[PDB]
Design a protein around this motif. Sequence first.
Motif, PDB file in Angstrom:
ATOM      1  N   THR A  87      -1.418  -5.168  -0.587  1.00 38.93           N
ATOM      2  CA  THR A  87      -2.389  -5.820   0.297  1.00 38.93           C
ATOM      3  C   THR A  87      -3.323  -4.830   0.986  1.00 38.93           C
ATOM      4  OG1 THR A  87      -0.785  -5.890   2.142  1.00 38.93           O
ATOM      5  CG2 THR A  87      -0.898  -7.823   0.712  1.00 38.93           C
ATOM      6  N   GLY A  88      -3.002  -3.541   0.887  1.00 34.79           N
ATOM      7  CA  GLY A  88      -3.824  -2.489   1.498  1.00 34.79           C
ATOM      8  C   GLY A  88      -5.010  -2.123   0.620  1.00 34.79           C
ATOM      9  N   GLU A 141       2.846  11.027   1.632  1.00 32.28           N
ATOM     10  CA  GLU A 141       3.871  11.294   2.650  1.00 32.28           C
ATOM     11  C   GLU A 141       5.293  11.351   2.102  1.00 32.28           C
ATOM     12  OE1 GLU A 141       1.285   9.132   2.937  1.00 32.28           O
ATOM     13  OE2 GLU A 141       1.076   8.419   5.006  1.00 32.28           O
TER      14      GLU A 141
END
Lengths: 379, 379
Positions: free
Chosen positions: A11-12, A119
């Motif tokens: 959804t990003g 990350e």
Amino acid sequence: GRLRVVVLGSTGSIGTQALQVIADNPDRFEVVGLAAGGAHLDTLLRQRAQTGVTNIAVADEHAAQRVGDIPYHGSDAATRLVEQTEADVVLNALVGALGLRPTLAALKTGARLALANKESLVAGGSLVLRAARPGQIVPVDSEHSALAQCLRGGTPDEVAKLVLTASGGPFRGWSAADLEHVTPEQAGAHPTWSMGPMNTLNSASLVNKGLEVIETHLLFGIPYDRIDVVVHPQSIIHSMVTFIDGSTIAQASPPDMKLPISLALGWPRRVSGAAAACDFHTASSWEFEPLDTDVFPAVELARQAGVAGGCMTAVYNAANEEAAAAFLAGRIGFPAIVGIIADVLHAADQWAVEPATVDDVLDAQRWARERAQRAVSGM
Amino acid sequence: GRLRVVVLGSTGSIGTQALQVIADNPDRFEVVGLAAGGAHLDTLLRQRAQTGVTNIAVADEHAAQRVGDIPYHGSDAATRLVEQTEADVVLNALVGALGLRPTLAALKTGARLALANKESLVAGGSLVLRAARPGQIVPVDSEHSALAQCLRGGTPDEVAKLVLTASGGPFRGWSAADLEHVTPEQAGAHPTWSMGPMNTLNSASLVNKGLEVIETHLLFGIPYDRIDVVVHPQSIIHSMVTFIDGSTIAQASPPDMKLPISLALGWPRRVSGAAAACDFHTASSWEFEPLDTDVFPAVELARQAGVAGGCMTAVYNAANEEAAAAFLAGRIGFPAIVGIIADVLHAADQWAVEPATVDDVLDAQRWARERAQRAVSGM
Ligand SMILES: NC(=O)C1=CN([C@@H]2O[C@H](COP(=O)(O)OP(=O)(O)OC[C@H]3O[C@@H](n4cnc5c(N)ncnc54)[C@H](OP(=O)(O)O)[C@@H]3O)[C@@H](O)[C@H]2O)C=CC1
Ligand SMILES: [Mn+2]
Ligand SMILES: [Mn+2]
């Protein structure tokens, strides 16, 4: 003979551009899984309908409940989705060090890990590297994608330097005094790339570039003293490799993540029409300038953390996550982000030890978040 | 191991720079032959003395009369030297028509041909291509060397466009009105010591770029409509390849012909320390702008000649040689150079037939010279 893709963080920004690449190329790719946090249910339901994939993970239990019949829900949802779904490629576009377990799970399945979630690699370090076969981790990041392409310009023994470009952020050329008064709204702008709220701040603080220096060392095995950073305001040259004969090979395109996404998904094969090419029928200029390391030491701190190794890079990232949250909340000033990272790294003696298990990495991060909170409390 | 190198045109700019690369890399290369014209016989004799290479050729029989111990002398001495010398690489840095036969001889030996001689491809065309095996010809010039490196960025099927950079010459940005006033001096007619006046003039007229476009087509098999030119005044980016996904791969270095020379000699292996790399410690910019094809139609004309095929590119080049020399002699103005090329080409369709022999190429050049002479004189 098409590739089955699990999309984590669907959804990003990256997740949605990835789905568009897949939709435009049904020949090459097929979505077989979606994971999201649950904050944008409108988007996720749209994705479910448009793709026809019901194989979905939603992190937030309440949000998963509101949708109903989500097969995987809770903090381990994305991880279990990866463990239980037959795939050829796992696209990890989750945000923050929370992408760690899904990254580890993906590698364990033997599938290609198209990695946007830098990350997880920065934090996992040698633990993630041990879980991977050669070339299993394929970078989605624009710089690392560029580097991988430019590395085709010679043999490994012919590489002299890897040259990462940096946009410089909204505060390129500003003094230390200028940065003292930076607002969350000011840091929420980016001159060249449209991204989520954390990557935009990280690009402004130059911590994103520090994380990318670490990512470069981990992906490509090049020593930190052979990884350079040049400021390039246009973000057209996405990075370059300098070879031992003096030749530099560079990758260039108008800023558009669909290019490195498409390349990561179908590596080594390029995807026709993925993005617009540079237009050399109109004038342009590609500018380069040295980074002001006095004003922006985040990259040097990343090198220090990286050279230390073990769990120290997890500490660097975790300290950033905490200080960044505090800045966005209006609790600390902008220069305090990288100030806190330095303070935390200086205290991080014990964390040079190589992680043996995920729990070692989590222990390091837990300590780093606490130490970061201590540093916030003192100001 | 060590590559055995025959240097044809040993006393010119390319030849002498190659000998320096070879002197600096005795591990990588050994000279096993030297060939020259005879105008710089003294230099060749010094080269024999310095290298200890006695396997030498002098084209000029008069010049050869001065020595008495030259194994190969007279017309086609360079060709005979190539035929009778065991070697791994032949560097053809001969100028003009006297390069064609040695190129053909070198290809037949099965050696790698490091090709600088423009006439071999521009005039020899299909004669040379039919003789050469895949990968046998390695280009020496900076643009073609850049393209060969950038093509490493993908498969042949993944290439969308080849983009040659052009300096734009001394009249970059000049209007057609400006060009009427151009003098031989302004166009680069100086008694410069290493190179004839033609190189600087061909740069200024954009005919050199046209010649490079023709050679690009022949070297890399890309249609003329997918070979573009961009003006880049810094000459730091030496050329670029755009792939089907939108990614462009570019080769960049400070101007220094030892880089492309070293790589042509060592191909596919780079030569450590050949040239200085781009340095990003001081600010710089790489500028691009389109070429005004209305004002500089030399490249469009080259594509026309190239598409027509056969001996038409031989005509293009021979018309230039005549017109360019007429301009240097003050018989015509600057804009008339490309004007006469156009007029000769438009009359030249009988030369679209493929040459069967070197004599066919020579006939085409003869016709084109005579034709350009009539155009210049008014007869
Ligand atoms: N955006 C870009 O252009 C680039 C991105 N990157 C990297 O890729 C990653 C993502 O980039 P970006 O798309 O901008 O990030 P975004 O903020 O735009 O999207 C984050 C995604 O992760 C999901 N998510 C958040 N928290 C959780 C959770 N606890 N569990 C499961 N899923 C969760 C969100 O779903 P939801 O919000 O609906 O709950 C969302 O789909 C980052 O690590 C970034 O560094 C790298 C290069 C450039
Ligand atoms: Mn990036
Ligand atoms: Mn050139």
